[PDB]
Amino acid sequence: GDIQFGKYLRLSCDTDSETLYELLTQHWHLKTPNLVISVTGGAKNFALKPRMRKIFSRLIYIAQSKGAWILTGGTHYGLMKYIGEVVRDNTISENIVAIGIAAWGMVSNRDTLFSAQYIMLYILDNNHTHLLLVDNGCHGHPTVEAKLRNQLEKYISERTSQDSNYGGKIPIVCFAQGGGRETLKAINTSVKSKIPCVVVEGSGQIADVIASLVTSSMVKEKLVRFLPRTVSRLPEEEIESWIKWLKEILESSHLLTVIKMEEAGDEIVSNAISYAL
Amino acid sequence: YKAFSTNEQDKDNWNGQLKLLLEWNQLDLASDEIFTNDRRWESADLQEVMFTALIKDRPKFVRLFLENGLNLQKFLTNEVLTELFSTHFSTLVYRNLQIAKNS
Amino acid sequence: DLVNFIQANF
Amino acid sequence: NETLAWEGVMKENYLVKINTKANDNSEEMRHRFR
């Protein structure tokens, strides 16, 4: 269903990444010279911060300047809505591509395909140019994008482009600030491949943990200090997985990069991305 | 604030704690502790406290409520505006405005 | 045009 | 309508300019010293 009040679609996990990339590039938009992907929590609980607002505005400006693609949750919650709003604001002052991958199963309204349009769980933001919904089933709405998104990023990483130097490749930077658990899994899978994720030691909890770290007791104390209620609600079994993912992330530091809180410069975002690449 | 939080009778209270921290003009504590992160207060939880902040002339708390997730457009409702203008309008200012408009 | 390709692809 | 949106964007730019001018005092050095 294509909706204009942009393009939308329903996806299956078995769909090949190469076919999706061919569709995207050939049909609609230009080749990507950069793939800044923001990972955060889908929960609506996103306490807006002043420095975070400035940082994300700078990130959007950089993405527009370089022509980068932006991949987000695209569910109109917390940081998602603001990261789309900055794109709108820049679009009203030569275009920004803000693909958003969400889950069909978790979506509330169903508008089957010509250009069916509806206005208004997990309603989806319409402020993103392109939306990709993937759910082979399971109306219970378990996360499904956590695989297709990573596969697409990896395939585009291997995609060779003879531009922007970088050895005929694409930057594919991985911005991470949210304190979600799925953010931890996303960071782990991103670092599994040679994707230079970058974190900021700001409001993010799972992000501040990694920023401070860069043993089991160390991880436990850090996550208790930064996520006391979350760890209290978390079961014992999940703690083993959390510690394992944290150890995997801290294993490699050449890919992971951090942003200091002291740095108040205007171009700290660009400095972090450039140093990571 | 420490006495209230550690009482354990109202430790779970996220609304009464916020109201108490609003009574005394302590903005940093409210920002760091009450809201912080990982709390699903939602946009409907700040209605009454933000109303009280408007009544009590707490500009910093008003700004914090607005920027932390409150939807001002949804906030302003016909009933809310009627209750705000009908009574909280200063009687001295009301008489002065009436005189100015009439004369 | 494109929509027809989407039919089979997706 | 559109002009109002552009006005809001320029207002945001102007407010950010005011904030930067205020922060240009460079007094953060002593706070970082502490």
Tab-separated table of C-alpha atoms in Angstrom:
chain	number	residue	atom	x	y	z
A	1	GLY	CA	0.000	0.000	0.000
A	2	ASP	CA	1.445	3.307	-1.193
A	3	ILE	CA	0.163	6.248	0.865
A	4	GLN	CA	0.510	9.964	0.118
A	5	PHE	CA	-1.002	12.658	2.336
A	6	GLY	CA	5.442	8.282	0.881
A	7	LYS	CA	5.840	4.789	-0.519
A	8	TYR	CA	4.952	1.888	1.773
A	9	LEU	CA	5.122	-1.875	1.420
A	10	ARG	CA	4.576	-5.208	3.156
A	11	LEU	CA	7.599	-7.478	3.473
A	12	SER	CA	8.359	-11.132	4.141
A	13	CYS	CA	11.484	-12.281	5.959
A	14	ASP	CA	12.305	-14.697	3.122
A	15	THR	CA	12.554	-11.749	0.710
A	16	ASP	CA	16.075	-11.432	-0.669
A	17	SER	CA	18.020	-8.336	0.355
A	18	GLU	CA	19.442	-7.964	-3.158
A	19	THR	CA	15.959	-7.751	-4.682
A	20	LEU	CA	14.908	-5.122	-2.137
A	21	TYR	CA	18.018	-3.044	-2.823
A	22	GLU	CA	17.471	-3.329	-6.576
A	23	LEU	CA	13.872	-2.163	-6.187
A	24	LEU	CA	14.857	0.756	-3.955
A	25	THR	CA	17.765	2.034	-6.040
A	26	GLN	CA	16.467	1.446	-9.570
A	27	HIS	CA	12.847	2.485	-9.055
A	28	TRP	CA	12.846	5.422	-6.642
A	29	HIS	CA	16.069	7.076	-5.474
A	30	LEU	CA	19.782	7.580	-6.095
A	31	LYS	CA	22.664	5.430	-4.890
A	32	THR	CA	23.624	5.904	-1.251
A	33	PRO	CA	27.030	7.392	-0.330
A	34	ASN	CA	26.396	6.857	3.402
A	35	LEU	CA	24.001	4.835	5.561
A	36	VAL	CA	23.796	6.475	8.980
A	37	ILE	CA	21.469	4.144	10.912
A	38	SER	CA	20.084	5.291	14.265
A	39	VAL	CA	19.243	2.591	16.814
A	40	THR	CA	17.175	3.365	19.909
A	41	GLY	CA	14.286	2.019	21.953
A	42	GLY	CA	10.841	1.810	20.409
A	43	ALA	CA	9.230	2.653	23.741
A	44	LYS	CA	7.497	6.029	23.848
A	45	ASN	CA	9.463	6.827	27.034
A	46	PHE	CA	12.133	9.067	25.480
A	47	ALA	CA	13.008	11.989	27.760
A	48	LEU	CA	14.035	14.737	25.344
A	49	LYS	CA	17.301	16.410	26.343
A	50	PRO	CA	18.740	19.738	25.134
A	51	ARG	CA	22.163	18.426	24.140
A	52	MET	CA	20.538	15.365	22.583
A	53	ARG	CA	18.307	17.654	20.521
A	54	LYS	CA	21.325	19.640	19.320
A	55	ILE	CA	23.319	16.476	18.576
A	56	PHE	CA	20.547	14.897	16.518
A	57	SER	CA	19.941	18.148	14.634
A	58	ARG	CA	23.639	18.162	13.725
A	59	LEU	CA	23.399	14.504	12.694
A	60	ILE	CA	20.459	15.257	10.394
A	61	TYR	CA	22.330	18.214	8.908
A	62	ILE	CA	25.362	16.019	8.195
A	63	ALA	CA	23.199	13.304	6.646
A	64	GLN	CA	21.564	15.855	4.349
A	65	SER	CA	24.925	17.393	3.434
A	66	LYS	CA	26.481	14.058	2.457
A	67	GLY	CA	23.268	12.618	1.004
A	68	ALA	CA	23.207	9.764	3.507
A	69	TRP	CA	20.319	7.380	4.033
A	70	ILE	CA	18.750	7.224	7.494
A	71	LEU	CA	17.217	3.980	8.777
A	72	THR	CA	15.019	4.298	11.867
A	73	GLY	CA	12.271	2.409	13.649
A	74	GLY	CA	9.571	4.539	12.040
A	75	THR	CA	6.898	4.037	14.708
A	76	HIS	CA	6.292	7.668	15.789
A	77	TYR	CA	7.507	7.311	19.370
A	78	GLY	CA	10.080	9.268	21.334
A	79	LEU	CA	13.320	9.866	19.464
A	80	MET	CA	11.712	8.469	16.297
A	81	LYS	CA	9.199	11.303	15.992
A	82	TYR	CA	11.830	13.983	16.605
A	83	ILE	CA	14.343	12.464	14.178
A	84	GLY	CA	11.595	12.561	11.569
A	85	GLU	CA	10.558	16.083	12.523
A	86	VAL	CA	14.089	17.388	11.974
A	87	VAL	CA	13.980	15.848	8.495
A	88	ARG	CA	10.698	17.633	7.800
A	89	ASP	CA	12.107	20.933	9.069
A	90	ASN	CA	15.178	20.640	6.851
A	91	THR	CA	12.969	19.631	3.915
A	92	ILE	CA	11.098	22.936	4.262
A	93	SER	CA	14.349	24.956	4.264
A	94	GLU	CA	18.547	18.278	-2.130
A	95	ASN	CA	16.401	15.679	-0.353
A	96	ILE	CA	16.834	13.426	2.683
A	97	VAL	CA	16.015	9.715	2.443
A	98	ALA	CA	14.620	8.480	5.768
A	99	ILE	CA	13.618	4.863	5.238
A	100	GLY	CA	11.879	3.430	8.282
A	101	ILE	CA	11.628	-0.310	8.965
A	102	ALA	CA	8.744	-1.393	11.202
A	103	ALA	CA	6.753	-4.553	11.926
A	104	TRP	CA	3.479	-5.228	10.115
A	105	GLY	CA	2.304	-7.550	12.883
A	106	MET	CA	2.586	-4.874	15.570
A	107	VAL	CA	0.796	-2.268	13.417
A	108	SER	CA	-2.775	-1.485	14.452
A	109	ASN	CA	-4.538	-0.200	11.335
A	110	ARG	CA	-4.787	-2.415	8.249
A	111	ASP	CA	-5.297	-0.672	4.887
A	112	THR	CA	-4.829	-3.183	2.081
A	113	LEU	CA	-4.099	-1.888	-1.415
A	114	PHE	CA	-5.063	1.917	-5.067
A	115	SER	CA	-3.311	4.359	-2.718
A	116	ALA	CA	-5.210	3.431	0.424
A	117	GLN	CA	-4.674	6.076	3.104
A	118	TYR	CA	-5.673	6.215	6.768
A	119	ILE	CA	-5.038	8.741	9.537
A	120	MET	CA	-4.950	8.508	13.320
A	121	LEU	CA	-1.046	-0.858	18.354
A	122	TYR	CA	2.161	0.920	17.298
A	123	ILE	CA	0.838	3.445	14.821
A	124	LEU	CA	3.523	4.221	12.243
A	125	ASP	CA	5.028	7.636	11.562
A	126	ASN	CA	4.014	9.124	8.213
A	127	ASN	CA	6.797	11.738	8.364
A	128	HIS	CA	9.312	9.279	6.866
A	129	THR	CA	9.636	9.247	3.086
A	130	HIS	CA	9.689	5.441	2.811
A	131	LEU	CA	8.299	2.785	5.152
A	132	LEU	CA	9.017	-0.954	5.037
A	133	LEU	CA	6.712	-3.256	7.012
A	134	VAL	CA	7.739	-6.903	7.442
A	135	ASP	CA	5.702	-9.598	9.183
A	136	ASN	CA	5.146	-13.092	7.799
A	137	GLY	CA	2.623	-13.575	10.615
A	138	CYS	CA	2.512	-13.858	14.396
A	139	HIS	CA	-0.004	-11.115	15.142
A	140	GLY	CA	1.427	-11.172	18.678
A	141	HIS	CA	3.944	-8.676	17.252
A	142	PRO	CA	7.358	-10.134	18.108
A	143	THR	CA	10.223	-8.117	16.685
A	144	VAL	CA	11.001	-9.209	13.118
A	145	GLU	CA	12.913	-6.221	11.744
A	146	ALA	CA	15.904	-7.144	13.938
A	147	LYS	CA	16.963	-9.582	11.178
A	148	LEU	CA	15.923	-8.031	7.863
A	149	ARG	CA	17.397	-4.649	8.798
A	150	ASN	CA	20.780	-6.169	9.659
A	151	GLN	CA	20.795	-8.309	6.512
A	152	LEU	CA	20.064	-5.252	4.368
A	153	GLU	CA	22.782	-3.219	6.086
A	154	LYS	CA	25.346	-5.991	5.618
A	155	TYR	CA	24.471	-6.482	1.950
A	156	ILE	CA	24.656	-2.751	1.230
A	157	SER	CA	27.974	-2.709	3.090
A	158	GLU	CA	29.350	-5.264	0.644
A	159	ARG	CA	27.848	-3.299	-2.270
A	160	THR	CA	30.787	-1.649	-4.035
A	161	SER	CA	30.437	2.001	-5.078
A	162	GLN	CA	33.302	3.810	-6.829
A	163	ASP	CA	32.669	7.117	-5.087
A	164	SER	CA	33.371	8.923	-1.813
A	165	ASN	CA	36.755	7.124	-1.651
A	166	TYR	CA	36.703	4.680	1.325
A	167	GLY	CA	38.168	1.980	-0.913
A	168	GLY	CA	35.129	1.854	-3.178
A	169	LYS	CA	32.783	1.005	-0.303
A	170	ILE	CA	30.070	2.737	1.742
A	171	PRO	CA	30.542	4.240	5.250
A	172	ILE	CA	27.618	2.388	6.922
A	173	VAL	CA	28.055	4.052	10.311
A	174	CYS	CA	25.883	2.853	13.208
A	175	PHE	CA	24.670	5.562	15.592
A	176	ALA	CA	23.441	4.217	18.945
A	177	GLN	CA	22.139	6.129	21.962
A	178	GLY	CA	18.940	4.452	23.170
A	179	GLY	CA	18.827	2.483	26.405
A	180	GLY	CA	16.749	-0.390	25.065
A	181	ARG	CA	17.580	-4.075	25.196
A	182	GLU	CA	16.870	-4.521	21.489
A	183	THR	CA	19.383	-1.709	21.034
A	184	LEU	CA	21.948	-3.948	22.737
A	185	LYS	CA	21.111	-6.824	20.397
A	186	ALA	CA	21.281	-4.486	17.389
A	187	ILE	CA	24.702	-3.198	18.462
A	188	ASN	CA	25.955	-6.755	18.946
A	189	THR	CA	24.821	-7.841	15.486
A	190	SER	CA	26.195	-4.661	13.893
A	191	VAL	CA	29.614	-5.181	15.481
A	192	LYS	CA	29.502	-8.834	14.408
A	193	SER	CA	30.187	-7.416	10.955
A	194	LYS	CA	32.732	-4.639	10.374
A	195	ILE	CA	30.277	-1.818	11.075
A	196	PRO	CA	31.838	0.998	13.192
A	197	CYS	CA	29.105	1.694	15.713
A	198	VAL	CA	29.332	4.979	17.646
A	199	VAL	CA	27.818	5.673	21.067
A	200	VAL	CA	27.343	8.826	23.141
A	201	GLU	CA	27.802	8.845	26.927
A	202	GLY	CA	24.653	10.891	27.431
A	203	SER	CA	21.122	10.062	28.541
A	204	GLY	CA	21.278	6.537	27.105
A	205	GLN	CA	21.551	3.845	29.777
A	206	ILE	CA	22.778	0.830	27.817
A	207	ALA	CA	24.823	3.440	25.941
A	208	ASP	CA	26.321	5.031	29.058
A	209	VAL	CA	27.231	1.537	30.272
A	210	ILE	CA	29.388	0.891	27.208
A	211	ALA	CA	30.778	4.433	27.246
A	212	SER	CA	31.893	4.046	30.868
A	213	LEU	CA	33.328	0.567	30.281
A	214	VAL	CA	35.523	1.813	27.426
A	215	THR	CA	34.247	-8.524	34.264
A	216	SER	CA	30.818	-9.849	35.211
A	217	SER	CA	30.831	-7.724	38.371
A	218	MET	CA	31.724	-4.601	36.381
A	219	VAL	CA	28.871	-5.118	33.913
A	220	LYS	CA	26.456	-5.949	36.729
A	221	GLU	CA	27.303	-2.864	38.780
A	222	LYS	CA	27.202	-0.590	35.726
A	223	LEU	CA	23.798	-1.816	34.551
A	224	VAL	CA	22.408	-1.709	38.097
A	225	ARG	CA	23.626	1.871	38.532
A	226	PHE	CA	22.206	2.998	35.185
A	227	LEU	CA	19.222	0.592	34.977
A	228	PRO	CA	18.154	-0.226	38.551
A	229	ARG	CA	14.436	-0.583	37.842
A	230	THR	CA	15.050	-2.268	34.484
A	231	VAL	CA	17.488	-4.805	35.940
A	232	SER	CA	15.166	-5.375	38.901
A	233	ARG	CA	12.376	-6.236	36.465
A	234	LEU	CA	14.808	-8.210	34.302
A	235	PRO	CA	15.088	-11.938	35.130
A	236	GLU	CA	18.289	-13.711	36.103
A	237	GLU	CA	18.465	-15.639	32.823
A	238	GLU	CA	18.471	-12.473	30.700
A	239	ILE	CA	21.429	-11.163	32.718
A	240	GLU	CA	23.681	-13.854	31.247
A	241	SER	CA	22.727	-12.789	27.722
A	242	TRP	CA	23.225	-9.116	28.593
A	243	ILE	CA	26.683	-9.779	30.036
A	244	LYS	CA	27.629	-11.887	27.013
A	245	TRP	CA	26.547	-9.162	24.582
A	246	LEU	CA	28.398	-6.506	26.585
A	247	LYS	CA	31.554	-8.636	26.570
A	248	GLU	CA	31.231	-9.155	22.814
A	249	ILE	CA	30.833	-5.407	22.250
A	250	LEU	CA	33.779	-4.524	24.497
A	251	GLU	CA	35.910	-7.183	22.783
A	252	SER	CA	36.498	-4.873	19.797
A	253	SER	CA	37.161	-1.168	20.357
A	254	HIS	CA	38.477	-0.187	16.916
A	255	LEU	CA	34.919	-0.436	15.574
A	256	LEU	CA	33.162	1.076	18.594
A	257	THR	CA	33.581	4.792	19.269
A	258	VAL	CA	32.400	7.091	22.054
A	259	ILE	CA	31.452	10.758	22.375
A	260	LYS	CA	32.557	12.540	25.539
A	261	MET	CA	30.100	14.625	27.537
A	262	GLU	CA	32.637	17.417	28.092
A	263	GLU	CA	32.918	18.175	24.365
A	264	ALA	CA	30.411	20.964	23.655
A	265	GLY	CA	31.642	21.779	20.154
A	266	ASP	CA	29.261	22.265	17.257
A	267	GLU	CA	30.969	19.665	15.028
A	268	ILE	CA	31.461	16.882	17.594
A	269	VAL	CA	28.987	14.680	15.707
A	270	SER	CA	30.952	14.928	12.463
A	271	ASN	CA	34.195	14.417	14.375
A	272	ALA	CA	32.879	11.208	15.939
A	273	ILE	CA	31.610	9.795	12.643
A	274	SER	CA	34.806	10.740	10.798
A	275	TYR	CA	37.050	9.223	13.464
A	276	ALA	CA	35.003	6.015	13.517
A	277	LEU	CA	35.222	5.637	9.733
B	1	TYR	CA	12.201	14.872	49.260
B	2	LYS	CA	14.492	12.261	50.824
B	3	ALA	CA	12.025	11.699	53.663
B	4	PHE	CA	9.150	11.200	51.218
B	5	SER	CA	11.026	8.913	48.818
B	6	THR	CA	12.487	6.660	51.526
B	7	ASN	CA	9.190	6.399	53.431
B	8	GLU	CA	8.267	3.401	51.214
B	9	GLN	CA	4.560	4.177	51.724
B	10	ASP	CA	4.554	6.465	48.661
B	11	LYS	CA	7.870	5.422	47.108
B	12	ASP	CA	6.068	4.087	44.030
B	13	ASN	CA	4.261	7.428	43.631
B	14	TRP	CA	5.587	9.140	40.512
B	15	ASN	CA	2.848	11.802	40.637
B	16	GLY	CA	2.892	12.836	44.296
B	17	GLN	CA	6.688	12.918	44.225
B	18	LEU	CA	6.568	15.222	41.196
B	19	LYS	CA	3.948	17.444	42.838
B	20	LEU	CA	6.066	17.767	45.979
B	21	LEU	CA	9.148	18.629	43.934
B	22	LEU	CA	7.022	21.197	42.080
B	23	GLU	CA	5.856	22.856	45.306
B	24	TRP	CA	9.470	23.803	46.040
B	25	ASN	CA	11.198	25.323	43.008
B	26	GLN	CA	13.674	22.477	42.468
B	27	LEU	CA	14.052	21.896	38.723
B	28	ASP	CA	17.274	19.871	38.506
B	29	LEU	CA	16.026	17.261	40.980
B	30	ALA	CA	12.724	16.872	39.131
B	31	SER	CA	14.497	16.520	35.786
B	32	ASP	CA	17.078	14.008	37.016
B	33	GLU	CA	14.984	11.827	39.344
B	34	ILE	CA	11.278	11.941	38.470
B	35	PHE	CA	11.446	11.726	34.678
B	36	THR	CA	14.970	10.398	34.069
B	37	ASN	CA	14.355	7.493	31.676
B	38	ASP	CA	12.639	4.108	31.427
B	39	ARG	CA	9.358	5.482	32.823
B	40	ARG	CA	6.121	5.293	30.828
B	41	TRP	CA	4.479	8.420	32.192
B	42	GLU	CA	2.958	9.164	28.767
B	43	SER	CA	1.545	12.511	27.628
B	44	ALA	CA	-1.556	12.268	29.850
B	45	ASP	CA	0.328	11.965	33.157
B	46	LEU	CA	1.498	15.606	33.205
B	47	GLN	CA	-1.970	17.166	32.782
B	48	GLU	CA	-2.738	18.121	36.382
B	49	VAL	CA	0.826	18.852	37.498
B	50	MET	CA	1.369	21.114	34.486
B	51	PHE	CA	-1.931	22.859	35.245
B	52	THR	CA	-0.678	23.467	38.784
B	53	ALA	CA	2.663	24.707	37.438
B	54	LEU	CA	0.859	27.206	35.212
B	55	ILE	CA	-1.192	28.359	38.200
B	56	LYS	CA	1.877	28.701	40.438
B	57	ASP	CA	4.046	30.568	37.881
B	58	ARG	CA	6.815	27.978	37.482
B	59	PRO	CA	8.323	28.891	34.090
B	60	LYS	CA	11.187	26.389	34.245
B	61	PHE	CA	8.863	23.536	35.203
B	62	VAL	CA	6.485	24.551	32.406
B	63	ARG	CA	9.351	24.421	29.912
B	64	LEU	CA	10.493	21.053	31.258
B	65	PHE	CA	6.989	19.589	31.004
B	66	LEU	CA	6.566	20.898	27.456
B	67	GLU	CA	9.942	19.683	26.190
B	68	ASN	CA	9.878	16.312	27.974
B	69	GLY	CA	6.934	14.969	25.961
B	70	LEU	CA	3.805	16.935	26.832
B	71	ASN	CA	1.513	17.703	23.886
B	72	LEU	CA	0.447	21.316	24.368
B	73	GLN	CA	-1.967	21.203	21.424
B	74	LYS	CA	-3.873	18.335	23.039
B	75	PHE	CA	-3.388	19.922	26.472
B	76	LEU	CA	-5.381	23.045	25.616
B	77	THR	CA	-9.032	21.971	25.627
B	78	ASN	CA	-12.267	23.940	25.728
B	79	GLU	CA	-13.029	22.891	29.306
B	80	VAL	CA	-9.445	23.545	30.431
B	81	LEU	CA	-9.371	27.002	28.853
B	82	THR	CA	-12.792	27.854	30.279
B	83	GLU	CA	-11.681	26.861	33.779
B	84	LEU	CA	-8.430	28.794	33.313
B	85	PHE	CA	-9.970	32.064	32.106
B	86	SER	CA	-13.119	31.985	34.247
B	87	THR	CA	-11.465	31.984	37.685
B	88	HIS	CA	-7.663	32.275	37.640
B	89	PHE	CA	-7.951	35.590	35.775
B	90	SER	CA	-6.929	38.208	38.333
B	91	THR	CA	-9.944	40.255	39.394
B	92	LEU	CA	-7.883	43.453	39.388
B	93	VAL	CA	-6.641	42.676	35.877
B	94	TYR	CA	-10.177	41.713	34.858
B	95	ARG	CA	-11.570	45.069	35.988
B	96	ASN	CA	-8.692	46.959	34.367
B	97	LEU	CA	-9.217	45.129	31.067
B	98	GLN	CA	-12.959	45.801	31.172
B	99	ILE	CA	-12.337	49.501	31.821
B	100	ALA	CA	-9.785	49.719	29.008
B	101	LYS	CA	-12.060	47.938	26.529
B	102	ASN	CA	-15.080	50.062	27.453
B	103	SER	CA	-13.310	53.441	27.429
C	1	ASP	CA	5.079	-0.657	-14.216
C	2	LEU	CA	6.932	-0.930	-10.911
C	3	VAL	CA	3.812	-2.075	-9.047
C	4	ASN	CA	3.547	-5.106	-11.332
C	5	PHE	CA	7.103	-6.087	-10.395
C	6	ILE	CA	6.245	-5.600	-6.716
C	7	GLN	CA	3.324	-8.009	-7.146
C	8	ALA	CA	5.605	-10.955	-7.930
C	9	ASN	CA	8.656	-9.832	-5.943
C	10	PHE	CA	6.794	-9.295	-2.652
D	1	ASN	CA	0.308	28.055	6.444
D	2	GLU	CA	3.596	27.211	4.735
D	3	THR	CA	4.894	30.687	5.562
D	4	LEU	CA	4.009	30.052	9.209
D	5	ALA	CA	6.047	26.834	9.180
D	6	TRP	CA	9.016	28.684	7.687
D	7	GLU	CA	8.530	31.355	10.358
D	8	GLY	CA	8.681	28.695	13.061
D	9	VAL	CA	11.859	27.221	11.590
D	10	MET	CA	13.524	30.634	11.493
D	11	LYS	CA	12.367	31.246	15.071
D	12	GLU	CA	14.076	28.025	16.137
D	13	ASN	CA	17.239	29.181	14.373
D	14	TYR	CA	17.055	32.564	16.127
D	15	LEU	CA	16.542	30.977	19.552
D	16	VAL	CA	19.517	28.681	18.958
D	17	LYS	CA	21.521	31.758	17.958
D	18	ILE	CA	20.584	33.457	21.236
D	19	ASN	CA	21.604	30.352	23.179
D	20	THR	CA	24.952	30.177	21.370
D	21	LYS	CA	25.582	33.867	22.048
D	22	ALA	CA	24.849	33.275	25.732
D	23	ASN	CA	27.157	30.241	25.832
D	24	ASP	CA	29.940	32.171	24.056
D	25	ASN	CA	31.024	33.440	27.487
D	26	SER	CA	33.566	30.573	27.557
D	27	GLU	CA	33.122	30.146	31.325
D	28	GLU	CA	32.760	26.365	30.926
D	29	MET	CA	36.527	26.087	31.460
D	30	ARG	CA	36.246	26.735	35.208
D	31	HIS	CA	33.351	24.289	35.514
D	32	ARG	CA	35.486	21.663	33.784
D	33	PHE	CA	38.298	22.621	36.169
D	34	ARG	CA	36.032	21.786	39.103
